[PDB]
Amino acid sequence: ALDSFTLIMQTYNRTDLLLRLLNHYQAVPSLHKVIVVWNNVGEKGPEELWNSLGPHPIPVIFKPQTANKMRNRLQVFPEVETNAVLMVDDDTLISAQDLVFAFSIWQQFPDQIIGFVPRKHVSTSSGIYSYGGFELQTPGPGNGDQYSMVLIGASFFNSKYLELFQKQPAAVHALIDETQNCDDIAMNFLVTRHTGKPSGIFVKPINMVNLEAEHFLQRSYCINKLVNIYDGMPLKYSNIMISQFGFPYANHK
Amino acid sequence: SALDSFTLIMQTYNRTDLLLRLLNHYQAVPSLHKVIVVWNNVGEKGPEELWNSLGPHPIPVIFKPQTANKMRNRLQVFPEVETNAVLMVDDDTLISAQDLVFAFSIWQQFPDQIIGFVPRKHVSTSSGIYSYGGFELQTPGPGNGDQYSMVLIGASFFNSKYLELFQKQPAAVHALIDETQNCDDIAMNFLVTRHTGKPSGIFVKPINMVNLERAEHFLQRSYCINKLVNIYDGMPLKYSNIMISQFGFPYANHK
């Protein structure tokens, strides 16, 4: 359980992908256990099929959920024995090389969200914010760009943030259920408020693949709602992009 | 102010023309508070008169003649240094302002580490015996990728407090540097990591750094790692594979 991480994968109507990803993730080094947050209410889980195809390198725990809520993966599962949690959406395949490297980065910054997907907030009207990525102008600073959030759907973060998440104002939880979105924005708000540092650090992935409209609109909406509830914009910008020295070979020159 | 600023310390020798050209560049870099030219040309008159004739300049440039031509002269505690951060650059290297502004921002976040553009390492193929090298040498690290255990001070940012700490090092250290007239950077890395318990430096990949420039040089460095290991009774250097780049600079370099 020491120097190991736990994979928390929430799944919904993607069982075929889930099983394929599981076949990949079970073999990643330093993986201690897998927790599948089964959000398909009233549907039999593929655990029988999974075991019939055993043995497997680590225990995979299927936890049936009473409702299909985005926040289910953020609960404090008793089965999690590690200090770090690896949270990945059930449609994303991240290479073992990216995971091993990112995990080693997390161990050096255990209080920050270490991930592969950076995003930001911008403002063009006092007190009004917008959610976006590199298609939006850099917020403030000089050259280059900035990110103020690292999405939890492809990251490593301290398991203690799951508990701290549960302890956030009811207005925050209310907001999450309301939109069935923005849980990662909430997590980023929560982390930076706890540390006083940028909520996360962006590690550029070498091999991460996705296997496959009011969504983005809700994103901006949530940032503004959260600013009201917390009575302030706590997110901090960063332009730190970490890559692995020598991987690929000679990438330093 | 001096807080959100850094001081350039450039040691020069038989490269006065080069020094001057480099000075024209560095003087215009943002957040530069002052420049200290460690003049190692014993017996020759400094270009200070020529410098002032071509003024005005953005910052004060202090020329400090040295009694002897020693590599460690740039590691002294100059009273004129008013910043917490020192920018040390050899007099043959031109680091772009963009690299410097970015690297300085990284240093501000890791004030106790050497933030630099030139990463190197030590390796050991025989129990207890070390060797100096770069990416042409096998990774000493666990798995894939490579590792670096040192960031050369000749193109880096580091805490000025380390100059004072260096003066307090065992005489054997100062002796070794004077002996080889090399290894000051290796001595600095030993010092920093022994002090922080963390890797001595953090590698920041440069976007635009250019060099405008004895085989014993390399051989001496390996010698110094072992000599230093004896002086300190151990190998304190810690490996790291963290390579930092600026998000979005160049544009879309995140994809």
Ligand SMILES: CC(=O)N[C@H]1[C@@H](OP(=O)(O)OP(=O)(O)OC[C@H]2O[C@@H](n3ccc(=O)[nH]c3=O)[C@H](O)[C@@H]2O)O[C@H](CO)[C@H](O)[C@@H]1O
């Ligand atoms: C990398 C990234 O940008 N991922 C985020 C984004 O993904 P997307 O908007 O791309 O949505 P998605 O379909 O990839 O779902 C993300 C995760 O939530 C699960 N899911 C989805 C729909 C549903 O009704 N029930 C359910 O449990 C799903 O199995 C997956 O693990 O927006 C979501 C909010 O909606 C979450 O913040 C995701 O982490």
Ligand SMILES: CC(=O)N[C@H]1[C@@H](OP(=O)(O)OP(=O)(O)OC[C@H]2O[C@@H](n3ccc(=O)[nH]c3=O)[C@H](O)[C@@H]2O)O[C@H](CO)[C@H](O)[C@@H]1O
């Ligand atoms: C990028 C890099 O690896 N730089 C280091 C390396 O440069 P090099 O070995 O490339 O040597 P170099 O000729 O560039 O000299 C480095 C610096 O030392 C100064 N100098 C040199 C010779 C002399 O007799 N007096 C004098 O003061 C010179 O002005 C310059 O600022 O080795 C040196 C030790 O020898 C120093 O550790 C340099 O920081």
Ligand SMILES: [Mn+2]
């Ligand atoms: Mn998706």
Ligand SMILES: [Mn+2]
């Ligand atoms: Mn040189």
